[PDB]
C-alpha cells in the first residue's frame, strides 16, 4: 500500500565500545594529583538511567584502569621535576648509631637512625663542609662506611617542600560525544553481563590512593562483601576483597623530629632529618581487634564458598624487599612501611575465626618503619626523597579492602592459603573503576519510513 523510503534520524540512542582520552575534574598546596588544571565538576551531574538494556563489563580488560595508571605516574613525575636532584649527597657517609636508651613497649627503636657525617660541596664550588644527618636504616647501605641506598644506578629527587601528596578525589570525564556506562547490579562481581545500567558524563571521584596489601579510603560495597577475581581457580591472579564496612586504622609517628636545611648548591637546599627532641620512638599502627575479627569472619565465609570444606589459612607475606612485601601508605609526606604479620596471623575451621585469644587487648599493633628514599612503581619514574615534616605525625584511614593472592594452591592437606600479596598498583585502581566502561555515541542512524521528499 506504500513504498518504504530511507530516512535519517539524528539523536539515535546507540553506542559502541571505544577507548578515548579522558579528562579530569575536581588551597595553595600544589596538590600533585589534583592540580589547579582540573576543571570543576558539575554541581548537578545528572545520571541517566537506561531502559531494558544489557551490557558486558570486564574490570580486568578495562582501559580506564590502564589510562589511570599512566596518569598517576605522569602526575607523580613532572610534579617532582623542578626540584633538587641530590646528586652531591652520593658520597661516603661516615656513620654510627644513636642512643635510643633515653618502657615504651611496642615503640622502641633497635639499632636504626644512624648518625652520618658527610663531606658535601657547599653552594660555593671550591668550599667543602662537613654536615650531619640522621638516616633510617632502610635508606642506607654499608660498603663503617655507608652510601645512600639506590644512589648507584638512579637519581633520587627531593620533593619540593611545599607540595602536598594528600589524595584528593579525581573525577574522570568523557569528552563530549562519549559517555561512561556504569553497572549498578548487585550481582555484577566485576565481570560479564549487567542489566542495571546507567550513564554519566563523569565518574564519581576517586581518591588516587597508593598503598600495598590494604586498600585505603576507597568505596565500600553497597551491602555485602564482594570477592572479585579474573579467575578464582588461578592462584596467580589477585583476589580483591571489597568490604561493606570500613575498619579503622590509626597510625602514629610520635617523635619531635626537627629538620635541618643544608645548602649543596646555588639555591639547592637539602632537607635533612636534623635531630630528635625528646625520647625517640618507632612508628606504629593500631586497628580495632573486634572489627578485624568480624571482618575476617565474614571474609572466610566468602572464601570458604569459593574453596569449600578446606581449611582457611591466612599467612604473612612470602618475604622479600620491605618496599613491596609490607603494608604501605603515606601520611603528609612520611612514607610508612608496616609489618602485617599480626593481621594475617592464623588459620581456622568452618567459618569460625580462631586463635585470637580473648583478653584485655583491644588494639592490634603493627610495627612500622619510615623510609625517606622511595620507589613508587619500582623501575618506573624516578626515586624520590621525602623531606621530614617536623614531628608528631598522626593520621587515620579507612580499610576498605584487601588484596589477596593464593600461595601456590598445591597444599595436599585440604587447606588453602592466602597472603597479603598483589601485583602492580593497577590492582588498586582496578578495584575502584571496576564498574565503568567507556563507549562512543553514534547519534546518526538509518531506518525505513513511509514518507517521501517533495
Amino acid at each position: 500500500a506504500a513504498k518504504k523510503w530511507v530516512t535519517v534520524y539524528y539523536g539515535v540512542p546507540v553506542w559502541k565500545e571505544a577507548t578515548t582520552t579522558l579528562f579530569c575534574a575536581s588551597t595553595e598546596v600544589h596538590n600533585v594529583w589534583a592540580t589547579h588544571a582540573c576543571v570543576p565538576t558539575d554541581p548537578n551531574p545528572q545520571e541517566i538511567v537506561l531502559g531494558n538494556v544489557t551490557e558486558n563489563f570486564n574490570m580486568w580488560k578495562n582501559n580506564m584502569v590502564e589510562q589511570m595508571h599512566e596518569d598517576i605516574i605522569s602526575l607523580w613525575d613532572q610534579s617532582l621535576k623542578p626540584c633538587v636532584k641530590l646528586t652531591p649527597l652520593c658520597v661516603t657517609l661516615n656513620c654510627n648509631n644513636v642512643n635510643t636508651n633515653n618502657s615504651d613497649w611496642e615503640k622502641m627503636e633497635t639499632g636504626e637512625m644512624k648518625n652520618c657525617s658527610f663531606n658535601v660541596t657547599t653552594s660555593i664550588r671550591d668550599k667543602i663542609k662537613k654536615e650531619y644527618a640522621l638516616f633510617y636504616k632502610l635508606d642506607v647501605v654499608p660498603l663503617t662506611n655507608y652510601r645512600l641506598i639506590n644512589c648507584n644506578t638512579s637519581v633520587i629527587t627531593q620533593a619540593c617542600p611545599k607540595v602536598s601528596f594528600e589524595p584528593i578525589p579525581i573525577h574522570y570525564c568523557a569528552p563530549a560525544g562519549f559517555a561512561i556506562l556504569k553497572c549498578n547490579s548487585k550481582t555484577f562481581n566485576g565481570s560479564g553481563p549487567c542489566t542495571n545500567v546507567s550513564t554519566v558524563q563523569c565518574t564519581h571521584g576517586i581518591r588516587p590512593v597508593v598503598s600495598t596489601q590494604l586498600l585505603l579510603n576507597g568505596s565500600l560495597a553497597e551491602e555485602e562483601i564482594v570477592i572479585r577475581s579474573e579467575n578464582i581457580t588461578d592462584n596467580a591472579k589477585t583476589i580483591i576483597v571489597q568490604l561493606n564496612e570500613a575498619v579503622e586504622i590509626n597510625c602514629t609517628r610520635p617523635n619531635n623530629n626537627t629538620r635541618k636545611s643544608i645548602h649543596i648548591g646555588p639555591g639547592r637546599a637539602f632537607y635533612a632529618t636534623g635531630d630528635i627532641i625528646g625520647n625517640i620512638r618507632q612508628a606504629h599502627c593500631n586497628i580495632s581487634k573486634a572489627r578485624w575479627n568480624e571482618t575476617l569472619g565474614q571474609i572466610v565465609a566468602k572464601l570458604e564458598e569459593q574453596f569449600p570444606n578446606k581449611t582457611i589459612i591466612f599467612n604473612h607475606s612470602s618475604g622479600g624487599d620491605p618496599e613491596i612485601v609490607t603494608h604501605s601508605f603515606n601520611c603528609g609526606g612520611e612514607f610508612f612501611y608496616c609489618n602485617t604479620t599480626p593481621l594475617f596471623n592464623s588459620t581456622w575451621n568452618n567459618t569460625r575465626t580462631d586463635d585470637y585469644p580473648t583478653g584485655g587487648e583491644q588494639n592490634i599493633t603493627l610495627q612500622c618503619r619510615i623510609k625517606q628514599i622511595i620507589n613508587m612503581w619500582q623501575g618506573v619514574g624516578k626515586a624520590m626523597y621525602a623531606p621530614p615534616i617536623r614531628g608528631q605525625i598522626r593520621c587515620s584511614s579507612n580499610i576498605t579492602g584487601l588484596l589477596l593472592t593464593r600461595d601456590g594452591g598445591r597444599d595436599q592437606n585440604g587447606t588453602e592459603t592466602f597472603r597479603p600479596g598483589g601485583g602492580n598498583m593497577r590492582d588498586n585502581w582496578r578495584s575502584e573503576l571496576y564498574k565503568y566502561k567507556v563507549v562512543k555515541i553514534e547519534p546518526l542512524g538509518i531506518a525505513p519510513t513511509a514518507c517521501k521528499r517533495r
Partner: antibody
C-alpha cells in the same frame, strides 16, 4: 508481582501456580515461595537463585517443584495435596548479590493465591 | 534447620504506648541475616526491617531493630493504631548447600 492459578483441588490432586514479573524482570533477583495457612504464620517452601540454582525447604519434602520457566515467569508445582495444605501461596522477591552468603530479605511481595483442598 | 521462636504472643497495649518483640534463633551466622515483616490482616506481609539494625525505606521511626547472635528484638516506639499488625521475624542465609530459611510464628500486636 502477581501470582495465579489457584482454586479448588481434590484430595491428592495437584496445582501449578505462576508468579509473573510484571515489570520486575527476574534477572538479578531471587524468587521465593512461601505459604500461609489460615490462622498461621509463614512457612518457607523454597526458591530460585538469580544464578539458576534451585533450592527447597524441609517443609516441602519433595512435594513441591520450583522452576523458572521463562524470563519473567516462575512457577510452583505442588502435588499429592491434603486438607492441611489449604493456604494462601505467595511469591516474593529477594535481591541477589555477587557473593557467597546472601541475606535474602524479602521485598516486592505479591498479593497471594488461594489454594484449597476438598 | 533453624528454628525461630517469638514471644510474647497476643500482645495488647494502649494507643500511645510502646511494644517490644523478643525473637530467638540458634546457629546465627550474624546479624545481617535477619529481617522483620509487618502483615496487616487480609494482605501480604510488607518489609519492615531488612538487617537487624536497618529499616526499609518508607518505615517511620519506630520498629527499631537490635540484637546479638541468636538474640533479636524489635521495638515499636510509638503505638499508633495504624501499626496494629502481626509482625514476623525472618532468618535466612542463601547458600549453595544450606539456605537455612525460617520464619517465627509471628507476633500479633494490638493497639487499643
Amino acid at each position: 508481582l502477581e501470582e495465579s492459578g489457584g482454586g479448588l483441588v481434590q484430595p491428592e490432586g495437584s496445582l501449578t501456580l505462576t508468579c509473573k514479573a510484571s515489570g520486575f524482570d527476574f534477572s538479578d533477583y531471587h524468587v521465593q515461595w512461601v505459604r500461609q495457612s489460615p490462622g498461621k504464620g509463614l512457612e518457607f517452601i523454597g526458591g530460585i537463585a538469580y544464578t539458576g540454582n534451585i533450592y527447597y525447604a524441609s517443609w516441602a519434602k519433595g512435594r513441591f517443584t520450583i522452576s523458572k520457566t521463562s524470563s519473567t515467569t516462575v512457577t510452583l508445582q505442588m502435588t499429592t495435596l491434603t486438607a492441611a495444605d489449604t493456604a494462601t501461596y505467595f511469591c516474593a522477591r529477594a535481591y541477589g548479590y555477587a557473593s557467597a552468603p546472601y541475606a535474602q530479605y524479602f521485598n516486592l511481595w505479591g498479593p497471594g493465591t488461594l489454594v484449597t483442598v476438598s | 534447620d533453624i528454628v525461630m521462636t517469638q514471644t510474647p504472643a497476643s500482645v495488647s497495649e494502649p494507643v500511645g504506648g510502646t511494644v517490644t518483640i523478643n525473637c530467638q534463633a540458634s546457629q546465627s551466622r550474624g546479624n545481617n541475616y535477619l529481617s522483620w515483616y509487618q502483615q496487616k490482616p487480609g494482605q501480604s506481609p510488607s518489609l519492615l526491617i531488612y538487617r537487624t539494625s536497618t529499616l526499609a525505606s518508607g518505615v517511620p521511626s519506630r520498629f527499631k531493630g537490635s540484637g546479638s547472635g541468636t538474640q533479636f528484638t524489635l521495638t515499636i516506639s510509638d503505638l499508633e493504631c495504624a501499626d496494629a499488625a502481626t509482625y514476623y521475624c525472618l532468618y535466612g542465609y542463601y547458600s549453595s548447600r544450606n539456605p537455612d530459611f525460617a520464619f517465627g510464628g509471628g507476633t500479633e500486636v494490638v493497639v487499643k
